[PDB]
């Protein structure tokens, strides 16, 4: 899946549950 995601766009990235928790933690801090 990683090969097909960045097949064309350099600036493409992936987000998952962990990022969300880091944000709600960043907000709460």
């Amino acid at each position, epitope marked *: *899946n*990683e090969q097909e995601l960045l097949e064309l766009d350099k600036w493409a990235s992936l987000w*998952n*549950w*962990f990022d969300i*928790t*880091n944000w709600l*933690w960043y907000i*709460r801090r």
Partner: antibody
Amino acid sequence: EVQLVESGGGLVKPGGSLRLSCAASGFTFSNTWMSWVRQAPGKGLEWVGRISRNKDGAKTEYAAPVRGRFTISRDDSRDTLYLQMTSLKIEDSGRYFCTADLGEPVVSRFFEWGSYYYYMDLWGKGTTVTVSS
Amino acid sequence: DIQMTQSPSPLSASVGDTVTITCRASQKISDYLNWYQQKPGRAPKILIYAASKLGSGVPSRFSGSGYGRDFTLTITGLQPEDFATYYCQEAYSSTPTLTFGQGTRLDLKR
């Protein structure tokens, strides 16, 4: 489809080392947290250790009985997870499962924002290890 | 560390019967609990996470509840396929221990 295939299990003498590996398919390995879980014969499940995405730094956290002896790594280049077991004991024998984990952010209560609910979502058939002289 | 206790190993039940599995905990874990199952010779599967939340693809007969220290897994309509062992798991420690329960096998009533 979506599956995990463990391999590399077999016979090894006490104090020896052994390397397991799991290949993944059907989902984005790089954006997924991975864990190992072992099961000794006739006994219950026991968490071994987990690893995070490379985007997070590939932080590894282990269970006390294996801490210091085992090492977990990943190779997103081939969607493969590894478990490097060294200084093996008789008590390390069992069926080692590989797992793709998931987290659920805490939402309802504000003062717990940051924590999450961790669980084992996908499992492989497993591979048996046997430590015996 | 957090320990997890569970119902007696073989609890007996017949088809179409409601069963419950207690999962007493040593320490207060709010609702950071999961439930799994593994059929006699297959890989474990996820059923309930966050104490109550139901995993995708899980039949609606399974239902979990509890908060803090006492937890339960209920299977209202018992079916033959789900004759297996069930494990509850802790997920509360800031430093992950992820200790599993002892397990609970389902015995065919006779």
